[PDB]
Amino acid sequence: GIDPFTAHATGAGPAGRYDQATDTILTVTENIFSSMGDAGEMVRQARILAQATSDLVNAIKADAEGESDLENSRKLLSAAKILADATAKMVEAAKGAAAHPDSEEQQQRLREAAEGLRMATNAAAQNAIKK
């Protein structure tokens, strides 16, 4: 219905491979820093990150096996492993920083864990197999 297919340009192909899921994670991550102060809502956001990461971890594995390269496949499998742990550390820190709101170390570990998760996810986003 009014398609950009060979119309104004050569189609309109967006995203990459993990873009929909990474977009969620990259965005929701910021929400933990935004919700910072509300324990229930903070942990809520972390649960979303875990959920979203779970999608990627399983996806990246299968997508890696679809690649016709050993090293790149190993990298993808590694990226998923890095991600899934960045999330695990993040989520655990978010729980503590939320339920223990004023606690300094809980906040500090969250800052680093969340940014680490942000890094891992944003990296997985970039390495996503397209084409």
Side-chain angles (χ1 to χ4, degrees):
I2 306 301
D3 299 75
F5 198 85
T6 321
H8 190 249
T10 310
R17 175 59 69 159
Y18 308 136
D19 182 86
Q20 183 180 90
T22 51
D23 170 78
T24 309
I25 300 177
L26 270 320
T27 310
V28 178
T29 297
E30 314 297 83
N31 295 332
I32 290 87
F33 294 94
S34 186
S35 52
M36 183 170 296
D38 190 290
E41 188 175 90
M42 287 182 59
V43 182
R44 179 180 304 138
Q45 309 300 329
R47 298 175 184 165
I48 303 174
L49 288 187
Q51 185 59 268
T53 298
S54 297
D55 190 287
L56 285 178
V57 175
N58 301 330
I60 300 177
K61 290 180 178 180
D63 184 47
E65 300 180 276
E67 174 62 293
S68 191
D69 190 75
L70 234 297
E71 295 298 278
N72 196 30
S73 187
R74 303 174 70 195
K75 184 192 65 180
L76 287 170
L77 294 179
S78 186
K81 178 180 177 178
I82 296 175
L83 166 52
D85 182 76
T87 314
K89 193 180 180 178
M90 189 289 174
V91 170
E92 290 299 276
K95 294 174 180 172
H100 289 179
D102 190 79
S103 299
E104 307 178 297
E105 292 188 61
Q106 290 303 150
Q107 292 302 330
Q108 179 56 30
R109 60 176 60 184
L110 174 61
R111 302 169 188 153
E112 306 185 283
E115 291 183 88
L117 181 276
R118 203 188 198 272
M119 295 298 180
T121 304
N122 190 28
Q126 188 65 212
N127 290 277
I129 301 302
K130 56 177 180 291
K131 298 188 65 63

